[PDB]
Tab-separated table of C-alpha atoms in Angstrom:
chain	number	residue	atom	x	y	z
A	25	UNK	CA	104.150	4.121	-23.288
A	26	UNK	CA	102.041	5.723	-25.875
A	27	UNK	CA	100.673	9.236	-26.847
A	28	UNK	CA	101.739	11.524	-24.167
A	29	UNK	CA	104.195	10.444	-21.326
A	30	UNK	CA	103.667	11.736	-18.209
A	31	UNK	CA	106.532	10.880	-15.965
A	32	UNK	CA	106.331	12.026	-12.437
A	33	UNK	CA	108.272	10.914	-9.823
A	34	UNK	CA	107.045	11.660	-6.068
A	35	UNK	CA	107.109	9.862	-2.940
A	36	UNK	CA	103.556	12.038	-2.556
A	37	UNK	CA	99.617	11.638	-3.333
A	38	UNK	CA	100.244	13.644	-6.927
A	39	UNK	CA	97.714	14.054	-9.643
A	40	UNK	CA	98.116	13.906	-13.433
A	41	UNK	CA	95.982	16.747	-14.835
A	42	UNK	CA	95.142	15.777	-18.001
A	43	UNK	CA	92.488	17.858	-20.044
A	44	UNK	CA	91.079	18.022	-23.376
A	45	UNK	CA	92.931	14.804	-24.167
A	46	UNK	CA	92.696	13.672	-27.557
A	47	UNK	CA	93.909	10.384	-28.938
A	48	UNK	CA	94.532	10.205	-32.678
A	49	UNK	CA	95.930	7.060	-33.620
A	50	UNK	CA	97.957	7.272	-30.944
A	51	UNK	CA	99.384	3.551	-32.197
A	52	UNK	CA	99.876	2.977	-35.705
A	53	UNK	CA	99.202	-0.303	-37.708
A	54	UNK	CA	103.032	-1.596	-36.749
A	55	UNK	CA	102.787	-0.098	-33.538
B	20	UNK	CA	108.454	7.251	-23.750
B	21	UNK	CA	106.268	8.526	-26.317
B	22	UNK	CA	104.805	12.050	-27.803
B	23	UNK	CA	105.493	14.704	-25.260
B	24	UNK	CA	108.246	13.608	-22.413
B	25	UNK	CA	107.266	14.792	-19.015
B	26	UNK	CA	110.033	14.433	-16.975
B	27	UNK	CA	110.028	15.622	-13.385
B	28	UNK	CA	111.961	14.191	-10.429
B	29	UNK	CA	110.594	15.728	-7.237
B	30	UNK	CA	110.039	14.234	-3.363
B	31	UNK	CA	106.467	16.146	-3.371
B	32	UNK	CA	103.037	15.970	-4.665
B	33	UNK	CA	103.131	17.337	-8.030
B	34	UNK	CA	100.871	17.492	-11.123
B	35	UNK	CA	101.142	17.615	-14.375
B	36	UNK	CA	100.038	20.066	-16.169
B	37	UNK	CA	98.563	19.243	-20.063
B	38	UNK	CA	96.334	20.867	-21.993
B	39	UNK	CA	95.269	20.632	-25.494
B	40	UNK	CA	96.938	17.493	-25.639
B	41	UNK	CA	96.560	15.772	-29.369
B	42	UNK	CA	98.137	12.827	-30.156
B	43	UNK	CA	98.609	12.847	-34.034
B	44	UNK	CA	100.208	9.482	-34.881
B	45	UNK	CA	102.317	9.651	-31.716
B	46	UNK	CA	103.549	6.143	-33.032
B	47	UNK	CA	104.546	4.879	-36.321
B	48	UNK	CA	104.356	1.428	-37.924
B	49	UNK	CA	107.863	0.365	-36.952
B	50	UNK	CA	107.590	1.845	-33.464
C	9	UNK	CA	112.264	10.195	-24.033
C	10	UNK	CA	110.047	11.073	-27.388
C	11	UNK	CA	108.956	14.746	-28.627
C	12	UNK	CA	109.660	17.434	-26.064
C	13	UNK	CA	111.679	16.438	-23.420
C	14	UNK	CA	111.007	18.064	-20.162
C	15	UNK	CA	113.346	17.087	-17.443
C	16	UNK	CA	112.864	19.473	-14.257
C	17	UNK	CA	114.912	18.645	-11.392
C	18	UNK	CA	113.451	20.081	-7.907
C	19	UNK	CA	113.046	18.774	-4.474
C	20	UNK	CA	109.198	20.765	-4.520
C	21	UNK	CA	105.727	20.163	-6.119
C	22	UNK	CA	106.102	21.429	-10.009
C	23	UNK	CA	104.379	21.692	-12.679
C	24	UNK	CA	104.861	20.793	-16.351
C	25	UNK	CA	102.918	23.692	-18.414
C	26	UNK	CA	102.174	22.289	-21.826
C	27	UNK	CA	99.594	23.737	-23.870
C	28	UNK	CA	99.118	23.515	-27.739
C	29	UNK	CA	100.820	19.697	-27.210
C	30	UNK	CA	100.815	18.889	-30.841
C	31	UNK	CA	102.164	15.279	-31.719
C	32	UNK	CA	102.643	14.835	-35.208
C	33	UNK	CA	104.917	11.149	-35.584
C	34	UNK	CA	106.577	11.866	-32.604
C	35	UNK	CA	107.845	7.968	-33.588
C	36	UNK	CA	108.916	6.981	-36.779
C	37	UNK	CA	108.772	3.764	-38.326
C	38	UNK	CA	112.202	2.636	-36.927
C	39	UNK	CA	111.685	4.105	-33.673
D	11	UNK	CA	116.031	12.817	-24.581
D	12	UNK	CA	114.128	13.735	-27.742
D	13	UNK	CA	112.922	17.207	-29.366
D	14	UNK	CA	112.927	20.279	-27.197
D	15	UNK	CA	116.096	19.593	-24.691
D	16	UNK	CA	114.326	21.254	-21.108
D	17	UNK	CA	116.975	20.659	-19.052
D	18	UNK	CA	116.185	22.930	-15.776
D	19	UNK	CA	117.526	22.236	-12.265
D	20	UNK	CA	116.817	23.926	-9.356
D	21	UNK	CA	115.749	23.577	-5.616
D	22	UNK	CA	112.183	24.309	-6.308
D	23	UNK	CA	108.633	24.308	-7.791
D	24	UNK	CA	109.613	25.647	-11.267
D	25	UNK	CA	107.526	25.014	-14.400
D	26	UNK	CA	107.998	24.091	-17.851
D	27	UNK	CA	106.388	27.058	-20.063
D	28	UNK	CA	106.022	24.958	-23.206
D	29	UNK	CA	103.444	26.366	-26.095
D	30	UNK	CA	102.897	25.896	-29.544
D	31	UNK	CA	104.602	22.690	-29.194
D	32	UNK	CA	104.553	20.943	-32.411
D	33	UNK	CA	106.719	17.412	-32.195
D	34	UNK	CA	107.457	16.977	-36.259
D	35	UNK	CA	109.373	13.403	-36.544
D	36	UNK	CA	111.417	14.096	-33.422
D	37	UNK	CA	112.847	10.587	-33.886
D	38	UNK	CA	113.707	9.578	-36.918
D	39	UNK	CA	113.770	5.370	-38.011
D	40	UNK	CA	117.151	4.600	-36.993
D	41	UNK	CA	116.237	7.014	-33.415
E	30	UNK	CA	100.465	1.301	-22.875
E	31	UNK	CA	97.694	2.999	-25.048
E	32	UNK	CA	96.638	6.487	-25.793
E	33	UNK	CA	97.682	8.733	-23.069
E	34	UNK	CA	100.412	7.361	-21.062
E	35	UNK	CA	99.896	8.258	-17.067
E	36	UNK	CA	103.445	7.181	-15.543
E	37	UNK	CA	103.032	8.302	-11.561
E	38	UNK	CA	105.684	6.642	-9.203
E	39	UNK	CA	104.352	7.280	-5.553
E	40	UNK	CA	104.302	5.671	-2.440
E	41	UNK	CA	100.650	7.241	-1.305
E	42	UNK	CA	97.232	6.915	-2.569
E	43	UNK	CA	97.456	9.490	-5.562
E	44	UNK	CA	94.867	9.371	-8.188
E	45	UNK	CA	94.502	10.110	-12.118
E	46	UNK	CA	92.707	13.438	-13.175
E	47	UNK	CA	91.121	12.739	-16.241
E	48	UNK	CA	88.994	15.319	-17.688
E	49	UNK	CA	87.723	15.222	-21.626
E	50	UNK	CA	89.208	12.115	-22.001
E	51	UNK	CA	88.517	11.092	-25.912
E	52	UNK	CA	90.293	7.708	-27.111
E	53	UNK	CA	90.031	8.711	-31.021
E	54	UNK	CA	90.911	5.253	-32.779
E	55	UNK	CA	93.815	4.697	-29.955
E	56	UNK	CA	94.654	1.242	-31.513
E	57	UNK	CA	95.377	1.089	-35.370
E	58	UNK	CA	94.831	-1.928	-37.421
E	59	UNK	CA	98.424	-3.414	-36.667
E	60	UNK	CA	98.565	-2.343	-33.193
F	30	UNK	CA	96.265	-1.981	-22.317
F	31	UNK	CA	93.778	0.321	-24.919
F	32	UNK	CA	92.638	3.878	-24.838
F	33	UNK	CA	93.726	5.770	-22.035
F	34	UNK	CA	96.795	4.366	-20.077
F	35	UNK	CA	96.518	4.581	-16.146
F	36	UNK	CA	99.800	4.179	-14.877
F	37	UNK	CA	99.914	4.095	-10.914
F	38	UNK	CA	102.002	2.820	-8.879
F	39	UNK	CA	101.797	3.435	-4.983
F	40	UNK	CA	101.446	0.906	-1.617
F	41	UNK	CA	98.011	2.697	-0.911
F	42	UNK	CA	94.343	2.539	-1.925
F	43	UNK	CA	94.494	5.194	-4.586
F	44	UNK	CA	91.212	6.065	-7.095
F	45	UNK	CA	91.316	6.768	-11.160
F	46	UNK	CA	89.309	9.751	-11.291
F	47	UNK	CA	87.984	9.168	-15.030
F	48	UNK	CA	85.530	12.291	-15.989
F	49	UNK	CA	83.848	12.065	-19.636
F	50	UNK	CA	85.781	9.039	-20.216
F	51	UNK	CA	84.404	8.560	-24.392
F	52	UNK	CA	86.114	5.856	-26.116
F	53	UNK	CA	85.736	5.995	-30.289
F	54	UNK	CA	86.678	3.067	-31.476
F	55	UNK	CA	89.449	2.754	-28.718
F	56	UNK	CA	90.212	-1.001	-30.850
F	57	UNK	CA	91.068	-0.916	-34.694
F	58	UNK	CA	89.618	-3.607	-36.874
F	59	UNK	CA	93.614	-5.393	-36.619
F	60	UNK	CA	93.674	-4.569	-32.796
């Protein structure tokens, strides 16, 4: 978990396609 | 689980598709 | 689960089109 | 579960047209 | 968990397309 | 766990295709 969640369910060679990803403090002091 | 949910249920080779993706504090102190 | 919650049900290779994915505390302190 | 609700079914490769997606507290402390 | 989250269930050799990947203080003080 | 999460699960010999894979201080001062 964390930031964006990119669930894909496939019994398949998929891809996640993730561009111009940018992590801001994706996790905070506490969590 | 977190920021942006991608849920997809599918028996084939799929990709998700994210762009501009900024995570702005996507978690908090307590979670 | 957490921000936008995509759930796409299909027996064929989709595609989740987010753009402009903005997460602002998409998670608060509790959860 | 959580924010935008996308709940789409069908029998093939559809796609979730999300933009200006902006995820402001979508859970709150207690959820 | 961390940043984005890449959640691909498959039973073939898939692989992660990660493109302008920027970790921008993923991990707070806390967590 | 830290920066960019690579979730992948599948019985074959997959590849994380990382491209401009920058980490800024991926790791708080606290963690």
């Amino acid at each position: 978990y964390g930031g964006f969640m990119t669930s894909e369910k496939s019994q398949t060679p998929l891809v996640t396609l993730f561009k111009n990803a940018i992590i801001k403090n994706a996790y905070k002091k506490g969590e």
